[PDB]
Subunit: 124 residues, 3 copies
């Protein structure tokens, strides 16, 4: 019953720039970018932030640029595991740094990053 | 950035809408949400966006769950203070929209959860 | 309606079940969940349903992650007072199911989280 934090990031996939065709292709695109930026930060701080990535669409007003029925998006989540990181604040600052880097590399005008309290049970 | 997020789980009612794939039912729910969100936005100036995800929900087959699980859609959202000036009013709007979604999807039941969250919005 | 939700993340072990697509992985994991949930329901009269979502999980390639991520499934659920009287007993049941799922999926590790939530159930 370790009290910790989870994050959730939502990003567009910018098909106008990366020209991905399917949701598997955009999932792999975002996953590859996260894999690179997470490793780069891990080399600097010894904190590796893994991410679960999920296909999704995001529904907003068509006048703001949303396609009918929703924009293709990826949801990234993760959770601070005390077996891997000993400082929750540093982990949180790392997630924020990665979220801003993801926004930049995905060429997104906006991005959301949330933190939620969670109780993590890790079975090994 | 302390705020609220919601999560709604809905069936896709294949027998009523006659969709044939997870992608089609995702777009069905997306279109319904897009319409009810716009309709409410016109009445109150509050627009509730939703992230929608494909899913399968597993429960007891004795209660009607299909062998391979029920095709469902998960909808989530979060109150951003840049777009809504009162979180409680936003929460009440989400509840209203969830009940509308339940009715439009012809669902017998629906869950709508609220979770405390800290939102960081980069622009 | 203050309560708890769970989230479990599991690998899908394509190298033990010979599967490929994400829809096929949802069906494999959903079938396992149906069976273990029913088994626990018979013992405790607590049935834990699950919403299952397709995903990939990104971690260091040096630790065995494929480039761009490993195929995974995310399972979530929520304790509903209409179906369970004691949230502590529900939580212990979820933990038992999570450990059983880890074994059935032949996974070296598994995460199970509990998050405070406010559930609105419309029926
Ligand atoms: C789908 S399970 C696969 C991998 O997927 C990641 N993962 C699992 N569940 C989650 C979750 N809920 N949210 C985010 N990432 C997750 C974790 O990185 C997990 O790694 P393991 O715990 O299985 O360790 C595997 C190896 O990798 C090392 N390792 C895994 N993660 C980290 C880490 N963050 N820092 C340092 N070492 C790590 C660990 O020591 C071990 O040798
Ligand atoms: C995947 S990002 C795309 C759009 O997807 C939606 N979105 C992004 N992240 C999330 C999330 N975590 N949960 C739910 N919806 C999300 C947001 O509606 C977002 O819009 P932006 O923040 O990028 O604003 C784009 C334009 O649209 C306006 N706008 C966007 N949302 C609202 C809103 N709710 N009310 C009023 N104006 C809004 C805003 O002023 C701007 O001009
Ligand atoms: C996508 S909706 C379909 C079914 O999907 C499951 N479900 C719905 N929302 C969620 C959610 N957020 N998380 C996890 N599971 C969910 C629920 O099991 C739901 O069942 P209903 O509430 O609609 O009851 C349907 C029938 O099944 C019985 N039933 C459903 N769940 C349980 C349960 N946990 N214990 C006892 N009886 C249960 C209930 O009495 C009724 O006859």
């Amino acid at each position: 019953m370790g009290k910790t934090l989870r994050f959730e990031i939502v990003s567009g996939v910018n098909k106008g720039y990366f020209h991905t065709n399917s949701q598997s292709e955009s999932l792999d695109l975002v996953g590859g970018i996260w894999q690179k930026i997470a490793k780069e930060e891990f080399e600097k701080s010894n904190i590796y932030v893994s991410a679960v990535i999920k296909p999704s669409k995001t529904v907003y007003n068509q006048e703001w640029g949303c396609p009918e029925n929703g924009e293709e998006t990826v949801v990234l989540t993760g959770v601070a595991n005390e077996e891997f990181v000993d400082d929750i604040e540093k982990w949180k600052d790392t997630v924020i740094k990665l979220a801003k880097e993801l926004k930049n590399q995905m060429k997104q005008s906006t991005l959301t990053c949330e933190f939620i309290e969670t109780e993590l049970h890790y079975f090994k």
